[PDB]
Amino acid sequence: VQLTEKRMDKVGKYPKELRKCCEDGMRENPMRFSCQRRTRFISLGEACKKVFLDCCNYITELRRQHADEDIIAEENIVSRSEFPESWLWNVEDLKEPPKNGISTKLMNIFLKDSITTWEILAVSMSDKKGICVADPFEVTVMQDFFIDLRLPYSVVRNEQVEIRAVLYNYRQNQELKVRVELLHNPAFCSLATTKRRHQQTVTIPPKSSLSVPYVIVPLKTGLQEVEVKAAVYHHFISDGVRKSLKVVPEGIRMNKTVAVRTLDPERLGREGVQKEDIPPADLSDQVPDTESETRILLQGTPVAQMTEDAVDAERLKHLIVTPSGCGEQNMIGMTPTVIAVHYLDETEQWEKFGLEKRQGALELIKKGYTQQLAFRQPSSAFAAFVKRAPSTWLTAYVVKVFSLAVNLIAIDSQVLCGAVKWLILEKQKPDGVFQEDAPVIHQEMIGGLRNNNEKDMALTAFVLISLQEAKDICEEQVNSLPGSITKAGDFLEANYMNLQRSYTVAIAGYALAQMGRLKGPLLNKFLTTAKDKNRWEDPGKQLYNVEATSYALLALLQLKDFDFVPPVVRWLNEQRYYGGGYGSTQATFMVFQALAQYQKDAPDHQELNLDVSLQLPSRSSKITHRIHWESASLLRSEETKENEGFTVTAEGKGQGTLSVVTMYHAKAKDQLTCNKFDLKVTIKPAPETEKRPQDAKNTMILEICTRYRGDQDATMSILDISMMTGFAPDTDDLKQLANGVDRYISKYELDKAFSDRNTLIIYLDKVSHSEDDCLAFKVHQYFNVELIQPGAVKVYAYYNLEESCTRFYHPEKEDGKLNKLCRDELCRCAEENCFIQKSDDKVTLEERLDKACEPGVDYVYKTRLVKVQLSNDFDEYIMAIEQTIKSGSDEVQVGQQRTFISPIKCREALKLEEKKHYLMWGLSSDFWGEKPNLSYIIGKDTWVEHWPEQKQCQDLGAFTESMVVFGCPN
């Protein structure tokens, strides 16, 4: 009783310092973790934990003894911030014949479609008189009748959604009679029919809202329009609503890379000709009735696509396939564009590409700097997240980027020089090794006691590389930079020999070459360690090997050794796996910079004179492309809508790239085996006593735990949860988790729409390997939907996308109630497309014979059901063929089993039972692919009849007798 009063009284004690801990302890943890368990997550000192434990124990005991609304009054009050956007922003001059100084002018404004009181402010600026201000003018606009149709974000194909419309009346002491109707649309099955229109009368009482529900069954994919009309009696009102909804296929959209090849007819090719074969993609899990698309891209130069994408703001974010919300990823705006600009400034390509885009690129860089300023701390240090401990690595990276960008844009000298001073004086140790006092991000962690020095060497090399750039910018401000540089270089040179990891060797060698100390035996270490004179690779790492190779390439370019460089360029080019490029930001930036540096510092100019011939197997005419240096655009594209392998011929001169990428829809299935993760997702009901919001209809609890499968993870793992149709997450729980003292998560975005379905991305600082890191939260369902399909959850690391896994979760049900929104007609609208509708339960022999023999009919099989497999999206029937009446294009022997795929909604339509004879016949479109034992998809044109092994028996036997009398002569 009076739990809030007790909580307030207990919080009254303790000073203003140790009161946040107690207040957080008062809050109920979303998960079922004990107070002792929760105290482990406290990052404050040893005094906050004691108060937190005391308050947790006290409140737990008090509530247990007690076992009204128990909510603590907020101390930091918040007010409404979102307001209607201002308009009428224009300037006009009064030019009319004055009358004793008065000059009238008539305006023509258009009031916005909203119900609010607007205020118009007028300020005049005369010459003889001066500035003056008039009083505001109030304009009030309101309506008596309002309609609002509520629809979900997206609906899966072949679903049962119950859309609704809300009617609002703003009259007092007067009810409103209205008639509401929904217009028929052939795309989806509705209550209204073509012959009969659905209309209904409703009375809205004064000062109240009324709900009108509706049910629609979507059939066709794409974008559909739903329009509702309302007519008011006794008053001339003809208002209505029209809203667009999205219907998506039943599956997950996945775009996959097919091939990535390097074109160089002279060197790589033989006799000045190169022939390359691109095999067909492996679309073995394509969802039925879905279209795939293949794209072929020819790049004249290895750095054309990135250079063109960086300048454009629209395509800037497409260079990566990962979210960018934190500190380092926010640099995506600055690092690429700058490089591109530089690559265009030194080389004579601006004229061809276009000079006018340079100003836009500078504006993008300015906006990137403005966004980056958000992460600055008062100590001139940048942290991974807002209000967190500063990190040396991020600070050094930001310093380097700002030093590079100072020439192009106006970078404040104060911030850069202060960051340099903080890096030098504070973090650097007397010995000359930079220390880190923040969680590791880029796998710089120590690998052990023997590998402890490796972390120090790597961090020192990176910080030295960053600092060397910021040498001539402000050297008078910081007079201790040369000494720190010399000490770091001496330390790096001292222990360069005792290096095992390829990345550390490469970075140290690059730093020493930049200083100019990589001579003698040290150099022998850098060149010899390379494998096949081509790459710097280590087992188990994919996206870090490319970065190490880029560092080695930069070191080689610095050393002025162009004999060993060309081989590495080919390997670097053929490292595009994710989509059509590199996923990780760091790897992409390093590859871009290395390739740009190689192109800029070229002893000879390799003019582009590429001639490419493509001869698709389906297409008859051949396609020819001619890529030349004078061409304004060095990028060619081709699109096809068929899975096939094709040959390409390249002749001429120059080094180019050819990328073939396929896009298709994949089926929903749990990953066979995770790489280095173990994900588990569970969605369960919730107690009915929970106070759901006004609009929500149901509530559930979703848990999503995981554990690393290695020595340790660190890094920054990101979880992605694909929400469902209608279901939405609870922001209160996420806010409590993120802003609470026991911080379970780093940050949640919940503000992206990259995928068709709603998504929630959670950023995690680390994943425990010894134990299992877990988190649960509540979700609410607003709309009433049936036959809902499962969602998905993906767990992956950022810098290494290969280590990832996926899981699927479905709302718990398991009930043969086959709940369906239909009452009497709507399912009859649904089963029409399922399969050919027989004219009668048992049609006559003549009709059956006439319908059996048609030009489109190719196969007629009499079979016996073997097994039926339950599922969620598509039902499967393992069937064995007993007798053959008419063989189709494919040849099948007697006794060979061919599986059958049917839609879920047809489960109660076909009415197929195991171990029963049946007859059927369909069209050639039922064949799916060409895999051995091809599956038969039951389409609309697929006749099926029961075959008995007693009037019905006599009639069916008489019908059977006439089926094999003739082999369908006509």
């Binding site: 404050l44 000192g45 040893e46 100590s379 004086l425 504070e426 140790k429 007397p430 010995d431 220390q435 006092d437 201790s480 000494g483 010399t486 000490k487 003698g520 035996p521």
Partner: protein, 192 residues
């Protein structure tokens, strides 16, 4: 015999390497101690000044307990006093090394084997190589080894001074980033 010619070529190559590589490098590594000791003394003085200075808000030092401030100031003053005495030893050593390097360079200017480049050692091998070789240009070679050993001793003096300075240099930097976090008097004084 060709062995004598090979030995002569090896000795010439070693002498050239010492004259052009070791001599120049050695001098540049002797004048850096003075520039580092003074820099670290200045940084320590700046850190002390920032502590309880004309203003506050110096990260965690602002809320630091009154008792801990006295100990921090005492240890900073002790380190500053200890580190000062090392300056003259490096200052004199720098000029001595410079003069000796100039003399050695002047002396050097006054005055088969390729497969042996794996040796990569030119520290004190000149006198010994001449020793095996024996078993107008010969006279200057006698004092080169003595001058090189004297330079090595002079550099060793500065190296020892710098290494000794580290003992007092490291303690101040430790307590700095120790108190810089949320570390209370306990651990601090315990380690001090």
């Amino acid at each position: 015999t060709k062995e004598g010619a090979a030995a002569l070529c090896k000795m010439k190559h070693l002498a050239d390497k010492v004259a052009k590589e070791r001599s120049q490098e050695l001098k540049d590594r002797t004048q850096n101690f003075a520039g580092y000791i003074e820099f670290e003394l200045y940084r320590i003085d700046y850190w002390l000044e920032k502590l309880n200075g004309p203003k506050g808000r110096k990260d965690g030092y602002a809320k630091l307990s009154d008792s801990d401030i006295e100990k921090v100031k005492e240890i900073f003053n002790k380190a500053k006093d200890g580190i000062t005495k090392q300056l003259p030893e490096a200052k004199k050593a720098g000029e001595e090394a410079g003069k000796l390097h100039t003399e050695v360079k002047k002396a050097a200017e006054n005055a088969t084997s390729y497969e042996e480049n794996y040796d990569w050692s030119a520290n004190a091998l000149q006198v010994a190589l001449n020793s095996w070789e024996d078993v107008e240009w010969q006279t200057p070679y006698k004092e080169t080894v003595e001058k090189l050993r004297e330079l090595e001793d002079a550099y060793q003096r500065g190296k020892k001074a710098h290494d000794a300075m580290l003992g007092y240099a490291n303690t101040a930097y430790a307590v700095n980033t120790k108190v810089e976090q949320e570390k209370p008097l306990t651990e601090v004084i315990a380690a001090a």
